[PDB]
Amino acid sequence: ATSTVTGGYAQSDAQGQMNKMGGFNLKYRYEEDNSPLGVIGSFTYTEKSRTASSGDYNKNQYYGITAGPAYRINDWASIYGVVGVGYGKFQTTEYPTYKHDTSDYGFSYGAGLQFNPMENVALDFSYEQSRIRSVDVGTWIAGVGYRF
C-alpha cells in the first residue's frame, strides 16, 4: 500500500577514447492525492566489465541518489522531475595497497514520462544529464514496477 517497486536498466554514453557503461536502478514511490505530489527516490550503481590487462579493471564505480516529485496525469502524459548527486571513486582490488584513489561529486537532473496501471504493468522512461567536466554523462533509463 502507498508503495511502488521499480527496477530499470541504464545506458551511459561514452566520450571519444572511452567505453559505454551500464547502470541498475531501484525506485520507491509514495502514493499521494491530487493536491500533494508523489515522492520518488532512486539509487543507481554503475558497472563496467573487466578490460585488457589486469592492471585496471572495474576499478571505477559510480553511485547516485536522486529525489523528485511525480505529477500524475491520467493519460500517458505524466511528468516527473528529479535531482540527485552522483560521484565516482576508485577502489582497491584487495591486497595491492596504493594511494591513487580519487573522488568527485556532480549534480544530475532528469525528467521522465510515466504510464501506470496496477501490478507490474507500469513503465517509466527518463533521461539524465550530468554537468560538464572534461567528461559529460548522458543516461537513458527504462524501468517496470507495481503498486501496493
The C-alpha atoms of residue 66 and residue 82 are separated, in whole angstroms, by 6
For 1, the grid coordinates are 500500500
Helices (H), the chain: none
> How far is 27 from 126, CA to CA, in rounded Å?
13
Label the pairing between strands 38-47 and 21-29.
antiparallel
d(CA 31, CA 34): 10
The domains found in the chain, sorted by start residue, are 1-148 (2.40.160.20)
Strand partners, 81: 111
User: In degrees, to the nearest 5, what angle opens at C-alpha 23 toward C-alphas 111 and 25?
Assistant: 60
Q: How many whole angstroms separate alpha carbon 136 and alpha carbon 133? A: 6
Q: Phi and psi at residue 55, in whole multiples of 5°?
A: -70, -35
Report which of 68, 148, 79 is spatially closest to residue 108, judged by C-alpha positions.
68
**Please, what is the end-to-end C-alpha distance for the chain in angstroms?**
4
Please give the method by which this entry was determined.
NMR
